[PDB]
Ligand binder design. Structure first.
Ligand SMILES: CCCCCCCCCCCCCCCCCCCC(=O)O[C@H](COC(=O)CCCCCCCCCCCCCC)COP(=O)(O)OCCN
Ligand SMILES: CCCCCCCCCCCC
Ligand SMILES: CCCCCCCCCCCC
Lengths: 50, 50, 51
């Protein structure tokens, strides 16, 4: 809070944004952007019914 | 041995038991491309941002 | 005071990257920044600035 009385908020010194945590990975499906998962299976598993 | 020859019903019952056990086995048995072959590994991952 | 100054001048400060994700389009530089490293010799420990 400044002596003039004006309030300094975070939005006045920074840009807040719902972004990502790890920014170093770009996944694209058939050129289109996308995000996927890799199912590494389990030790004792049924490769078909799973 | 040779005492099954005199008792065909015993042999047939043993065959039926084998077939039943085999069917029960194939109904519930895991299927996979390959079993666990590689020696077990443990991976420790740590992250230091920047 | 000596302990605090040793803690300050014997750190592993993570500088970061000079241009990294999310990077602006048309970016052709990618380097790491080395700000500080842990001291290695008693001579270096002798030159820690106390005041
Ligand atoms: C392998 C078998 C052992 C070698 C051959 C020995 C005789 C086996 C059976 C056999 O032909 O004996 C007949 C019946 O068995 C008998 O009289 C007694 C059989 C003795 C062997 C024991 C067999 C049982 C084994 C069970 C465990 C197997 C593992 C199970 C997962 C005898 O002829 P008979 O009785 O008509 O003659 C008297 C009537 N006059
Ligand atoms: C099955 C074990 C090896 C063969 C045993 C033969 C036993 C002699 C013939 C049957 C006598 C009743
Ligand atoms: C007669 C049957 C012999 C079987 C032995 C298995 C170890």
């Amino acid at each position: 809070v400044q002596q003039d009385g004006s309030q300094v908020l975070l939005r006045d010194v920074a840009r807040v944004e719902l972004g990502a945590e790890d920014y170093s990975t770009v996944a694209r499906y058939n050129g289109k952007p996308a995000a996927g998962i890799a199912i590494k299976l389990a030790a004792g598993a049924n490769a078909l019914d799973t | 041995a040779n005492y099954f020859i005199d008792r065909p019903v015993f042999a047939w019952v043993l065959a039926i038991i084998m077939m039943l056990a085999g069917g029960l086995a194939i109904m519930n048995l895991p299927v996979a491309q390959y079993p666990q072959i590689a020696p077990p590994t443990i991976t420790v991952s740590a992250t230091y941002p920047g | 005071d000596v302990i605090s100054q040793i803690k300050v001048q014997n750190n592993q400060i993570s500088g970061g990257q000079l241009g990294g994700m999310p990077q602006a389009a048309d970016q052709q530089l990618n380097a790491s920044i080395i700000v500080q490293t842990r001291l290695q010799t008693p001579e270096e420990f002798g030159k820690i600035l106390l005041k």
